[PDB]
Design a protein around this ligand. Structure first.
Ligand SMILES: NC(=O)c1ccc[n+]([C@@H]2O[C@H](COP(=O)([O-])OP(=O)(O)OC[C@H]3O[C@@H](n4cnc5c(N)ncnc54)[C@H](OP(=O)(O)O)[C@@H]3O)[C@@H](O)[C@H]2O)c1
Ligand SMILES: NC(=O)c1ccc[n+]([C@@H]2O[C@H](COP(=O)([O-])OP(=O)(O)OC[C@H]3O[C@@H](n4cnc5c(N)ncnc54)[C@H](O)[C@@H]3O)[C@@H](O)[C@H]2O)c1
Ligand SMILES: NC(=O)c1ccc[n+]([C@@H]2O[C@H](COP(=O)([O-])OP(=O)(O)OC[C@H]3O[C@@H](n4cnc5c(N)ncnc54)[C@H](O)[C@@H]3O)[C@@H](O)[C@H]2O)c1
Lengths: 174, 359, 378
């Protein structure tokens, strides 16, 4: 019942856009997709596009999980933002590049009172013109609950390993 | 209402249950914020920094706590039995929030109960998503994991990273992390970013992927003699960091003396479980001991070794826990239906209320 | 032609001038290689590892050097008035290779000269590119640069890396490296490894690009003087009181926000330049740490005291001695290879002799005494 999508053609969507927010999560860490992610980002800045990374307080499986991996891929600190300084900017962005995140974006935290993720503030990725989730499958996250964002008009899935998908997208950007 | 934060009095505690950011938030909620002078010294938070945020400075502990409706601290208050009665400084009927260690320290719970103090033991915070912001176990453990590596690198006489030079190459350090909770994961990350080859082991199945998600290698057997695979790597290890812990129980023994005799000299062990008995029986609290060519390091209170970053995080945990209950109209009502309140309340209004302590 | 290497009896000195890799190479040249008992314990080099590589083991210092045609040490040998008289243990007429100190150590030089001992001073190694494999300043100061960051992080009550967390964001530590030679470059790299935001400065113009390659940001003071700051030797000169002021004002904007300051600036034959005065320390954040690696040459900060950690104005100023010996088990194999690379080219091999070229500037810019003559342009 959900909408699909593949590696192909996510490269120009971001290349054509004025602004993109990258939203990394645990899956990004599992695949070690971070060196490919950073190279995907600065080809964009070489095009004149404005890039950002939105870090949820509990992305990954430990405090600072995304920070160490992003630091290893040499992402500049000035492009990395915490949930409170970045959440309003989704409104003004053409693309939400979600790579290996899920629970961190899940709207049932604001709605659905009787849910396991309720009350945890999330990143408001839906408010971006378009949302791309990279993950291997439709499988759930740490909470073990479905995410409504996967199936609406403004969302497109990219079903592959986070390292493979991003590497492929960089080649399509050239 | 008044809310008070004293200095920490226990030997070696350099943390404090406040920060300038959190002071100005408490004021916004309609609190008068008082802190004991010198309370933030070990956390690099001066009295002037505090006063600029909107707080008042008290000259002594007693005076800070005199009229406080709410009291915040990091470690449990000392009792008369320990030679310093801090419980007696807290106003009758007041609210205390701290790391009580309440399930293993019934004496302090009884002393708070006698003064009709309502005590919230923060270490008993429920493991739900919305309380991760109020969780002092993970905020403090995380920084301890980082420190373990820093302490290991300090005590080691080789560099962490591989270095290729004109005069020859020096190999990387080999690190073995035992136990992959919050501390263990930050230890793997800190060791890896410093250039070490990192191996980790844990009993739990789901940890193997966590280790790899930080670039570590899990010790595998590709049954109950899995110690062969462990020992094969331990014999090649320069730094062993043990983090394995079990609430209200002695820590599991992961490196036996027989295992340390098989390690290379110059190796170091960092035993983060030393206060619960140690994962290595050769470790001694508050000391670096040398046996069989190996330094076994067993510093106490590792989060206080990072006290200047630990303290802001601890005060934010406290604020996040308190904020939803300050509906002013200017009072504090801790709603019983809240699991965060019921999971954490140890005694209330003159009676012990936590079901683990009523008997 | 047999070579012997003693253990270091000097307080704190844990480096040995030998390794299994090197004795295997010395045997090939034609050396019987005796080594004092337990000489590599501080360097984590065992006697059994020496043997297997091809080394006999002497049970004392006098027994190792007794018939040794060549002797390798790390630091200058102690003289009669220092306590034990190691110079006298050495067989007369032998050749001695180490950091003999020299220039600032005249007692040792005349005593070795009295016993016909031909000694070679490795600190005076020419600053030409081919001698980098024989160069002890570089091998040892590289590791001191690493160790500075480790000591800074140890003394600091905060974490280095940025961490976004459920309790809020841990900010990154900001590091300022004063002087970007061999030690300063490794301090930048090691601080960046740990997630710090790294700032750097130096008087030599070519440093700017080296800092940026490591991902640090460089503090240009220029004064037009950075073009003519580096010499034909590659070392710095005295810049002047006016530049120092121009430098101190530029530095201050970052230094107020700086958590760790690592100072490494040296000037040959001169006291170490003052980069952070006590006035500047007073502007720094409480909990800050200064690591002064130039402490044994005067210091880049006047509040530093050798072998101690000083606390003033809520700032820790750290001034450990012999920083490379705090990394002794890495330092030692590298030191022993500096010496091996220096020595190998001048071995005959066929008759097992040692004719040190004389014409090779590596040889002549190093020989402090030869057969009872001091022979050096001091
Ligand atoms: N950070 C902390 O301190 C901490 C600690 C404990 C728990 N948590 C919890 O962990 C969760 C973190 O949220 P999150 O969004 O970062 O992670 P998450 O919600 O658990 O989801 C991770 C996603 O990444 C995908 N993934 C796994 N391997 C992948 C691969 N190799 N390539 C591409 N995608 C892959 C998975 O989908 P596929 O199966 O399709 O691949 C999965 O849905 C929160 O619920 C948080 O409360 C955090
Ligand atoms: O999360 P957290 O910070 O609460 O972790 P924690 O403090 O509960 O413990 C840290 C880690 O130690 C591990 N552990 C416990 N007993 C062990 C044993 N006998 N052998 C190996 N590992 C063991 C746990 O699986 C856990 O991942
Ligand atoms: N064999 C060789 O060719 C050889 C050997 C060693 C070093 N070198 C070269 O020499 C250069 C210096 O290396 P080093 O580690 O010996 O330097 P050093 O130890 O003599 O000094 C460290 C740094 O401090 C700087 N400095 C001095 N005064 C300063 C001040 N006023 N303010 C700011 N910085 C100041 C110097 O410019 C230098 O970069 C490097 O380029 C290195 O490669 C060459």
């Amino acid at each position: 019942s959900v909408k699909a999508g593949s590696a192909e053609d996510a490269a120009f969507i971001m290349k054509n856009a004025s602004k993109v927010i990258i939203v990394p999560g645990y899956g990004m860490a599992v695949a070690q997709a971070q060196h490919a992610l950073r190279e995907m980002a600065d080809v964009l800045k070489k095009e004149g596009v404005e890039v950002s990374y939105a870090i949820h307080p509990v992305a990954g499986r430990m405090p600072g999980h995304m920070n160490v991996l992003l630091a290893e891929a040499n992402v500049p600190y000035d492009e990395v933002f915490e949930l409170e300084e970045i959440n309003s900017s989704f409104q003004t962005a053409d693309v939400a590049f979600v790579i290996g995140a899920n629970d961190v974006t899940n709207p049932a935290a604001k709605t659905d009172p009787s849910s396991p993720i309720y009350g945890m503030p999330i990143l408001d990725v839906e408010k971006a013109g378009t949302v791309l989730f990279i993950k291997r499958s439709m499988a759930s996250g740490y909470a073990g609950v479905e995410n409504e964002l996967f199936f609406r008009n403004n969302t497109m899935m990219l079903f592959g390993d986070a390292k493979k998908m991003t590497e492929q997208i960089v080649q399509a950007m050239n | 209402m008044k809310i008070a934060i004293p200095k920490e009095r226990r030997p070696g505690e350099d943390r404090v249950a406040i920060s300038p950011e959190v002071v100005k938030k408490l004021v916004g909620l309609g609190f008068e914020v008082i802190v004991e002078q010198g309370a933030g010294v070990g956390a690099s938070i001066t009295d002037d920094a505090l006063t600029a945020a909107g707080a008042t400075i008290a000259s002594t502990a007693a005076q800070a706590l005199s009229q406080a409706d709410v009291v915040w601290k990091v470690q449990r208050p000392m009792t008369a039995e320990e030679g310093t009665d801090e419980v007696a400084l807290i106003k009758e009927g007041a609210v205390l929030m701290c790391h009580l260690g309440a399930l293993t320290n019934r004496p302090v719970v009884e002393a708070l109960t006698k003064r009709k103090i309502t005590a919230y033991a923060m270490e008993l915070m429920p493991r739900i998503s919305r309380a991760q912001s109020m969780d002092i176990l993970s905020s403090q453990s995380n920084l301890a994991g980082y420190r373990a590596v820093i302490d290991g690198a300090y005590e080691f006489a080789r560099a962490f990273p591989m270095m290729m030079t004109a005069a020859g190459t020096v190999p990387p350090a080999r690190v073995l992390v035992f136990g992959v909770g919050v501390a263990g994961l930050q230890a793997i990350a800190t060791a890896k970013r410093l250039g070490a080859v990192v191996m980790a082991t844990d009993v739990r199945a789901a940890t193997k992927e966590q280790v790899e998600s930080l670039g570590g290698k899990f010790i595998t057997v590709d049954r109950k003699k899995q110690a062969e695979a462990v020992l094969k790597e331990l014999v090649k290890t320069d730094i062993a960091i043990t983090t394995a812990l079990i609430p209200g129980k002695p820590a599991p023994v992961l490196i036996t003396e027989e295992m340390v005799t098989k390690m290379k000299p110059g190796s170091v062990i960092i035993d983060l479980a030393v206060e619960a008995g140690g994962n290595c029986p050769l470790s001694e609290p508050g000391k670096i001991v040398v046996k069989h060519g190996v330094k076994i390091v067993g510093h106490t209170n590792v989060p206080s070794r990072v006290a200047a970053d630990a303290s802001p995080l601890f005060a934010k945990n406290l604020l996040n826990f308190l904020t939803p209950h300050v509906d002013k109209d200017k009072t504090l009502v801790m709603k019983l239906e809240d699991e965060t309140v019921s999971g954490t309340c140890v005694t209330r209004d003159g009676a012990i209320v936590h079901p683990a302590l009523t008997g």
